[PDB]
Design a protein around this ligand. Structure first.
Ligand SMILES: COc1ccc(-n2c(CCN3C(=O)c4cccc(OC(C)C)c4C3=O)nc3ccccc3c2=O)cc1
Ligand SMILES: CC(C)(CO)n1c(=O)[nH]c2c3cccnc3n(-c3ccccc3)c(=O)c21
Ligand SMILES: [Mg+2]
Ligand SMILES: [Mg+2]
Ligand SMILES: [Zn+2]
Ligand SMILES: [Zn+2]
Lengths: 323, 323
């Protein structure tokens, strides 16, 4: 039922070497992958090698995993392969700047989870699938898509010559699958508010214990959300272009409702496209700024993220005011 | 300007007596008015008299109102005089089964609002009038048609010997015009989704209180939508025939767009008649079933509506399956 890669695809990836100029840039939080589409699979390999090591995964098995993952990402406007590598890059930048804060079993799982977190996205919300009783909503009652993304990840790893986590003991293997499970479920934005709530109180009262697994998993969750929203941390022209992509996806979902006689929420309605600048300001103020603020409080090296978020908020604020 | 009834028309109505056989059928929710065309105006009078008494309105003024309302309903395939009386009948059945929950003034207003809710329908959607900048969209920015229906109701009552509420105190009169205003605006399906969602929430958290005017207006609104969609609660052959009438009206609207070059949505496209069973399944699942479900939860005697809705959904389910 999955979509395996061709021999051609993984072999070419194995041959790819990252140009020396982009070595500097890939270390920066505001790095846009956008202009280098042919390099995106190659960029993930680099990040995996630069973080955990050149001998952490079997190069053959790794290249087959990446290229098969790419094939299970649909041609949707925003929740595509480009997003999966943008999110992973941000995770790489965070994991680099907090090098001794996470175990090599967390480091491996976190990058793989970021590349897989939106696997098989059909450009529809959890609310859409529940409202139209889609077979996926029948399998997973809550965090519908996120539970499906995790199921597709597990299915890719279950393919011949794809299990990149096969060299781990049964204990070490079930441990990493759980890191990935939790990281992907955490990408369900509805769960985020509560997570950034509990993390805010835990930071204030100094109760956040990094040795406590339950507490550990909450930080990883926020790290996932911060990576998932990193489009608001890029330079203004990049940020502006990405906004157009997620709207195009939202509008297409609304169009599907309009066809059935249903009225979409303003966000999903393309006839309320002028409401987008105000909607962005609302999202940045209610979702993005709180996220990066708390992330910086827990992991201070992640400060540039919050800085770039603020810069873009100001840009949206200028758009509203008519520059 | 309006369309006044003839002396002949209202005089004959005053003389009409309902057949003793029908007395029991009119009390049932699944009652089809379709076979009794000559009796439709007479049926409304009966319902008025059995709901609010025989001395609630001046028989002369009432018969003139009904017959002139009938004349301001166009010969469109679905949004016609037959629809008005079907909607009103369903409202009568709901009022009857929950008699003491409502005031004599709401019973008066809701039945009149149901007979008037589609007054002067031209067989076009609000989406159409707005996209093609029709003069009616210039007057009313939102709920375009519904605001026009309320304006035509007020215009009929403003006719000589037509003011059926003239015998109410200035306070009662302005309260009944507001009951009607709100009930007709509520027939704009776009507003329904928010209304259903809010009411479901209020029921779940037990915060719903019929003594709270704001809550009361939300229930009346849902009652209006349930009545507006009662065609899906009739027996299968009736339900099937009505679907043909709304589609004849939608197809005519699509034809108007095709003439200007614009491509209608599948629902409004007559070359796309095969997608109709799936369109119905989507409408029943996303609109009709949620509606009756919530209505039954607020007013449990209205359960037959949800029962018959389910029976028709199963019928559409069978059509898709090739049964
Ligand atoms: C809970 O707080 C809010 C605040 C604002 C919104 N909102 C938005 C943001 C949409 N949106 C996401 O709901 C999202 C989720 C995840 C990522 C994302 O943007 C990515 C590119 C980072 C986005 C995004 O733009 N745009 C609108 C556009 C027109 C009219 C209304 C709105 C509106 O109410 C929604 C939720
Ligand atoms: C209920 C009916 C007529 C059943 O045949 N129906 C249908 O099949 N599709 C639809 C339908 C589909 C799309 C939008 N409105 C619809 N309405 C509608 C129209 C105007 C005001 C309120 C609701 C229906 O009555 C209906
Ligand atoms: Mg997601
Ligand atoms: Mg209407
Ligand atoms: Zn994502
Ligand atoms: Zn109607």
């Amino acid at each position: 039922h999955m979509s395996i890669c061709t021999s051609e695809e993984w072999q070419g990836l194995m041959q790819f070497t990252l140009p020396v100029r982009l070595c500097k840039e890939i270390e920066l939080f505001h790095f846009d992958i956008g202009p280098f589409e042919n390099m995106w699979p190659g960029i993930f390999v680099y990040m995996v090698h630069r973080s955990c090591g050149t001998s952490c995964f079997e190069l053959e098995k790794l290249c087959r995993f990446i290229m098969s993952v790419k094939k299970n990402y649909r041609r949707v406007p925003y929740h595509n392969w480009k997003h999966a590598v943008t999110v992973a890059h941000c995770m790489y930048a965070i994991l680099q700047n907090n090098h001794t804060l996470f175990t090599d079993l967390e480091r491996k799982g976190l990058l793989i989870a970021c590349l897989c977190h939106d696997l098989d996205h059909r450009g529809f919300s959890n609310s859409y699938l529940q409202k139209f009783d889609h077979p996926l909503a029948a399998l997973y009652s809550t965090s519908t898509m996120e539970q499906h993304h995790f199921s597709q990840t597990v299915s890719i790893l279950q393919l011949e010559g794809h299990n990149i986590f096969s060299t781990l003991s049964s204990s070490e293997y079930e441990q990493v699958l759980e890191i990935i499970r939790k990281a992907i479920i955490a990408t369900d934005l509805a769960l985020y508010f509560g997570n950034r709530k509990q993390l805010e109180e835990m930071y204030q009262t100094g109760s956040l214990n990094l040795n406590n697994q339950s507490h550990r998993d909450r930080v990883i969750g926020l790290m996932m959300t911060a990576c998932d929203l990193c489009s608001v941390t890029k330079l203004w022209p990049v940020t502006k272009l990405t906004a157009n992509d997620i709207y195009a996806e939202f509008w297409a979902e609304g169009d599907e409702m309009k066809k059935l006689g249903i009225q979409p929420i303003p966000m999903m309605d393309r006839d309320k496209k002028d409401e987008v600048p105000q909607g962005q300001l609302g999202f940045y103020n209610a979702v993005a700024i709180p996220c990066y603020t708390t992330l910086t409080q827990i992991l201070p090296p992640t400060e540039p993220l919050l800085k770039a978020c603020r810069d873009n908020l100001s840009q949206w604020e200028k758009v509203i005011r008519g520059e």
